Design a protein around this ligand. Structure first.
Ligand SMILES: Cc1ncc(C[n+]2csc(CCOP(=O)(O)OP(=O)(O)O)c2C)c(N)n1
Ligand SMILES: Cc1ncc(C[n+]2csc(CCOP(=O)(O)OP(=O)(O)O)c2C)c(N)n1
Ligand SMILES: [Mg+2]
Ligand SMILES: [Mg+2]
Lengths: 801, 801
């Protein structure tokens, strides 16, 4: 680390280009409206919430940026991409209001958006589709999301898809937020990728929410040390302009020594006392430092401020960051939390009114009025002139992309709809589907294949020589290889899946990884992706509890689908055949990037197990998209059942169908369930609608339009709940579900499918059991089947194993 | 960053204390047996998998540790806590086999454990309770887990609970793994806490899985840079002993320069060529770097090895790490990937046998035999001699603690079982329950409250005064304040929740945080916690989609219970009342830390909403623990329904019962469901048993014993699936579920409960709907209820809003 002073000395500091006095009047009005918005919300006494102290500490930092740096979306590019610190939203709304982009009625509806004309608590594009762009309130995601957004912008330029050289990514972070592993865990990537189009602005007010970040330490030195060691350009903005005289005349170096040795805890104590106290405990530590302010009054000493509140020091930092190349820059802005709010941090708000010279009658304070600048006023003119120079207003968002893509038709995937020559897997099918898309002139170069180190495990080796690996294996490479870093790969996926909005340049990402390390490991990011309206594909490879048989407990995924169904705009599928993978990918491509432009993303689990891939049944396309279709009906005069399967288990369910017919004379209807989740949601929607329209023609759940009423059995490679979720909509009185509940373990696929009780043997027993209960066959038959199949009726429940 | 040479120069290198020749004979046998184990598995052609190259590159590092450093569990402490790199498992098994702790039959069942006498693919305590200790295969979790384990050990010492001063925590990592954000994301914490009982060992073989970590750079320099920047003591083990005389002879320092300028890509090139290619491209880079290897034969040059393969260099690194104080130490060990395997990473087997002078004859080689050292042999004597001087063998694990605790009885929670004067929340009930435990002599000091910055939000501040905050507010503080770091807090919780096994010292942790940032954010650690047999409590505060009303989309949790039900050994509850909280916590304590010592952990969601807390009905104990109990029955002659509710929504379900009786003469049975998940699991266990015992009387799900067959409606603050999961077990033919599917948004609780269609008015309408559908009432009564309650029948579906 370096001395606890500004990185940029006054001598190298550029002249401030703006009208400081005018900007302060405008800024004071914004601080005011921000506070009023939150206080009005508090007055309603509805537990609405909202913060004020945070924006107060960073208001000047943002003000300098809005006046001289942030470029808004324009005809050439999406402008600067600003990841606003989540809880300072009231400050963004206040400025928007003054710019005339929001009404008073909207500020009055802060945190009350159910009725349509309110404002979200935090930046949520899903709720405010034309205003916010990036979800940042979940601490940690913003910084890593920003790093990969910056890398993605360079990717677009290097690929020759769009000149993004005029765009900068700004990430506004708190110092307490930096403790989240995601916040610093990927800062080395910025150095590897030379992201000089990235700027981290860390508001260092030395405090978390409940207390100091490191009371007996110096968080600023800690941050400087690690970012410096990571190869970043660190710019510290420590002290305001009043300190310049002091640091300049102290030829003893004692003041610096004092600033260096004083810890975060003591600095916080000062900002709760007064001038006299600072003179005694701070400057009074050494005779040399005591002499520097001897001729100063207590008031003059109390005026000394931290750098993050001085427009001149702030400007210098951002300007230098804008000139730095070959690496990312992080600005450490020293501020005071609860700035100008007094001890606090009706009438008690007249303190801030006087502190910031707010032009509001001390008679109207009770009314908590909003301040506005009339058209023609000096303030109004200035406010708009500075923004026009920067191409308009920010934040803003375009919900749809403008261009028309010529997507491939289902027929282009024709080869995958036919019976396959060799035994392949759904993952191999996925790769072949990707190849078809890579032949489409319209979207071939808009495709963004993303992988988490493991590429050989997914047979992606072929695409390598074909489209190359992005490596600024060169700068024209198309595939993003992020190594052992699912969160990083996920953030790359997110930047690509939202490029249609951010840069009005639709890109179509396909991120394939070990399904177990999907939602379970980066679920918080998947939730934010939905909020950000991500349109892309998440491919969970090596999925299924019993399919990735040798890997064991931390790799065998039998629940990612349970996690994915919790995300509203995520459409999940678990196909068993190659032709289903084709119809699904094609449909998803059409829904998200076709004229419909549906705001959803897809999650498709694929397998690493090879088996026979039959041809798609004529007319099954729509059923595949809806979640279920009938594969075949097998004759049998001793009984009749329904058998459902998905993923790798479907082949075993079909095996059971044959066993039931040839050994027991039991006939059956076999169905391939491509999506239990979409069928469950369709059913929930139908039942909701019918309940609200009791007098009208009821809607029938899709699954009830496919299945009949004979006893049913379902088996999958996931936990029982995956198939049980449609119980309510299944038109049969008997519905037994087999699943892989329990921790995985290492063994052969055969042994695991027997252990998890989902193989053909268990399907037969479950089906016979249902028939026996209906008196259609003797219970002894079921008991003998259990014996014949060597089933241990008394082994421990797999869930407890 | 320092020069690309060893940190410890030969002049400061301690004398190696062991028999190099003999240790190598032992090591070669371990290398051989590890390889045989994987090869034999492969021959089965069951896609079992397993690695070899990784252990080959790091065997010498682990060998030095086993011979001179690793302390085994003993009478004083749990010994050294080693987080073994998961993929080197075959090497640990090979050694255990040689030490006579594993049989040949077990080795032959490598990756085949369904039948009971096999070995897990990776370290999984759940699968091998007396062998493995820490789950490490999920990349990234190992390093952050180890940091907090080391922190926890200091805590135990500072709190006077146990002297852990002789324990060292070792985390063995791969360089590719360091890319995981969690790997380096928390390293500054080790510095803040001066964790001199922690050692990171990074195997830098320059390659991850599908290529190098950073071919165009120097991964070792990147790692040194960020770890040095984070305040760690970095020890680089770059070159073997053969280089010493050379480097010493080097006067122009040109050799140093040569090494510094060469990047990972180059080094991996020489790593494949030959002794001649090296004197040309490497030593032939500069004239001065030629005279050094002039009097050297191509064979002598090709002999130059990397430091990670030199026991003398490795020993010096660990010795220095062992003596270092004030901070953590990281050892960067330079090795060769697929070391000694030449061919790959029968001729192949013969090759390795000759390379390591393995004592296997040509006549036995095709049998892929394991090697053993008979008692009395030199190897057998030394192997066991070294371990005995180090207190025994490891890894080893003790599944149950020996001590007997005197747990508080339910009566000790008496005040919580009675009606409350003041309106409070389930979170307030939780804090009071904790205070009761803090008055119990036997466990008061064993409790470990854990928080992530936010404390006042959960009303915990009342405790900070009593037990204090751990801060080496002092070293005796009992509460762990981890700041904005859910993952870090989760790791501290894990270290404490498994202390009963690791240090034979049961500790009872309670980690409270915003439920949204629970499984969704650290789900991979929660899965690992179940594998590690964690026993403790996870408290999801501010839960429920409509209850954390002002925060919005990324805070409103209506799905954490869907994520938690995927973890086999996690018991989940969503209580509505304070007495339910008391009963649940008491039972959890008894089960996990009483005589039963059950290996499960608890997840309990609590609320921030205050309301009337009634008294616990007499005899409701069993029901509360099971998941459901009948609260009351309300008379009605025009019909009868069953109403189920949980969490904050129960209050509204009871309100609906009143309206149904008063306004429509419809009576009902009202139930409080404390856990839909335990109920669903119970139901699944019964149906499974019934399916497997067709000749026996069907067992009845507990929920079916409590409920009757009248139409039922269920409503919760979570998505519909949470209540729908018990559909198959509910005795009624009609079961309607209301839930909070869809993205959250900001507003009053009233508007959100109406928006998500879960409030009183919707429960009433759902109930009436089932009655009308059955014929008990006219449809028009439903249509008018919808009008009367001002319900918008055409409002968009909340899941889509
Ligand atoms: C993952 C996550 N955990 C916790 C919170 C709750 N939270 C909101 S603000 C805050 C503290 C912010 O501190 P800091 O980052 O230092 O910013 P400041 O407000 O001081 O500028 C916390 C913990 C959150 N939003 N996300
Ligand atoms: C979270 C997670 N992602 C991916 C994997 C798959 N994986 C297994 S080994 C490996 C690479 C190992 O490379 P490194 O850490 O450098 O160690 P080495 O084996 O080379 O010694 C990967 C990505 C995993 N186990 N966990
Ligand atoms: Mg802060
Ligand atoms: Mg490696």
């Amino acid at each position: 680390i370096s001395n606890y002073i500004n990185t940029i000395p006054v001598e190298e500091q550029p002249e401030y280009p703006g009208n400081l006095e005018l900007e302060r009047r405008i800024r004071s009005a914004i601080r005011w409206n921000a506070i009023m918005t939150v206080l009005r919300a508090s007055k309603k006494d509805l537990e609405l919430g909202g913060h004020m102290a945070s924006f107060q500490s960073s208001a000047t930092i943002y003000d300098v940026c809005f006046n001289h740096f942030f470029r808004a979306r324009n005809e050439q590019d999406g402008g600067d991409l600003v990841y606003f610190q989540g809880h300072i939203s009231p400050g963004v709304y206040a400025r928007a209001f003054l710019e005339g982009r929001l009404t008073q009625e909207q500020l009055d509806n802060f945190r009350q958006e159910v009725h349509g004309n309110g404002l979200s608590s935090y930046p949520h594009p899903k709720l405010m589709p034309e205003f916010w762009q990036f979800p940042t309130v979940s601490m940690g995601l913003g910084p890593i999301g920003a790093i990969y957004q910056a890398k993605f912008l360079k990717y677009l330029e290097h690929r020759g898809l769009k000149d993004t050289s005029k765009q900068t990514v700004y990430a506004f972070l708190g110092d307490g937020e930096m403790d989240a592993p995601e916040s610093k865990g990927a800062i080395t990537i910025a150095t590897r990728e030379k992201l000089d189009n990235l700027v981290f602005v860390i508001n260092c007010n030395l405090q978390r929410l409940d207390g100091p970040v490191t009371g007996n330490g110096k968080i600023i030195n800690e941050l400087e040390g690690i970012f410096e060691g990571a190869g970043w350009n660190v710019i510290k903005v420590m002290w305001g302009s009043r300190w310049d005289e002091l640091l300049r005349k102290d030829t003893s170096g004692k003041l610096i020594q004092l600033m260096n040795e004083t810890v975060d805890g003591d600095y916080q104590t000062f900002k709760s006392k007064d001038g006299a106290y600072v003179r005694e405990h701070f400057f009074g530590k050494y005779p040399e430092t005591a002499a520097l302010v001897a001729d100063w009054t207590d008031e003059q000493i109390w005026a000394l401020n931290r750098g993050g509140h001085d427009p001149k020091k702030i400007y210098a930092a951002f300007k230098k960051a804008q000139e730095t190349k070959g690496k990312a820059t992080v600005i450490l802005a020293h501020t005071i939390k609860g700035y100008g709010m007094g001890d606090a941090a009706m009438d008690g708000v007249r303190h801030i009114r006087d502190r910031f010279n707010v032009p509001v009658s001390d008679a109207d304070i009770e009314k908590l009025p909003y301040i506005t600048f009339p058209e023609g006023s000096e303030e109004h003119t200035y406010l708009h002139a500075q923004r026009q120079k920067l191409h308009g207003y920010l934040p803003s968002r375009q919900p749809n992309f403008t261009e028309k893509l010529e997507l491939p038709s289902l027929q282009d995937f024709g080869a995958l709809l036919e019976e396959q020559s060799k035994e392949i897997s759904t993952t191999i099918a996925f790769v072949r589907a990707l190849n078809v898309m890579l032949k489409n002139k319209s979207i071939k170069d808009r495709l963004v294949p993303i992988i988490a180190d493991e590429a050989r495990t997914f047979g992606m080796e072929g695409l390598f020589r074909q489209i190359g690996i992005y490596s600024p294996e060169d700068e024209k490479g198309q595939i993003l290889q992020e190594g052992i870093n699912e969160l990083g790969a996920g953030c790359s996926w997110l930047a690509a899946a939202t490029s249609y909005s951010t840069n009005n340049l639709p890109m179509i990402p396909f991120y394939i990884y070990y399904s177990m390390f999907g939602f379970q490991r980066i679920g918080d990011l998947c939730w934010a992706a939905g909020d950000q309206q991500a349109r892309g594909f998440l491919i969970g490879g090596t999925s299924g509890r019993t399919t990735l048989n040798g890997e064991g407990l931390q790799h065998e995924d039998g629940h990612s689908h349970i996690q994915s169904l919790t995300i509203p705009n995520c459409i999940s599928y678990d196909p068993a055949y190659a032709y289903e993978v084709a119809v699904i990918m094609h449909d998803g491509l059409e829904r998200m990037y076709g004229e419909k432009q549906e705001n959803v993303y897809y999650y498709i689990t694929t397998l690493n197990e090879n088996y026979h891939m039959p041809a798609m049944p004529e007319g099954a396309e729509e059923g595949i998209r809806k979640g279920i279709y009938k594969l075949e009906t097998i004759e049998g005069s001793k009984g009749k059942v329904q058998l459902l399967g998905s993923g790798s288990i479907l082949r075993h369910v079909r095996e059971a169908a044959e066993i039931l017919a040839k050994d027991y004379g039991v006939g059956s209807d076999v169905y391939s369930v491509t999506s239990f989740t979409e069928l469950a949601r369709d059913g929930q929607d139908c039942e909701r609608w019918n309940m609200l329209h009791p007098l009208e023609t009821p809607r029938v759940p899709y699954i009830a339009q496919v299945m009949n009423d004979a006893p049913a059995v379902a088996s999958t490679d996931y936990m029982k709940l995956f198939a049980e979720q449609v119980r309510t909509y299944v038109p049969a009185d008997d519905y037994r579900v087999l699943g892989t509940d329990g921790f995985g373990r290492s063994d052969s696929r055969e042994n695991l499918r027997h252990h998890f009780e989902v193989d053909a043997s268990y399907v037969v027993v479950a089906a016979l059991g249902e028939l026996a209960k209906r008196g259609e066959i003797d219970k002894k038959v079921v008991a003998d089947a259990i014996a014949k199949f060597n089933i241990d009726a008394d082994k421990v429940n797999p869930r407890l194993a």
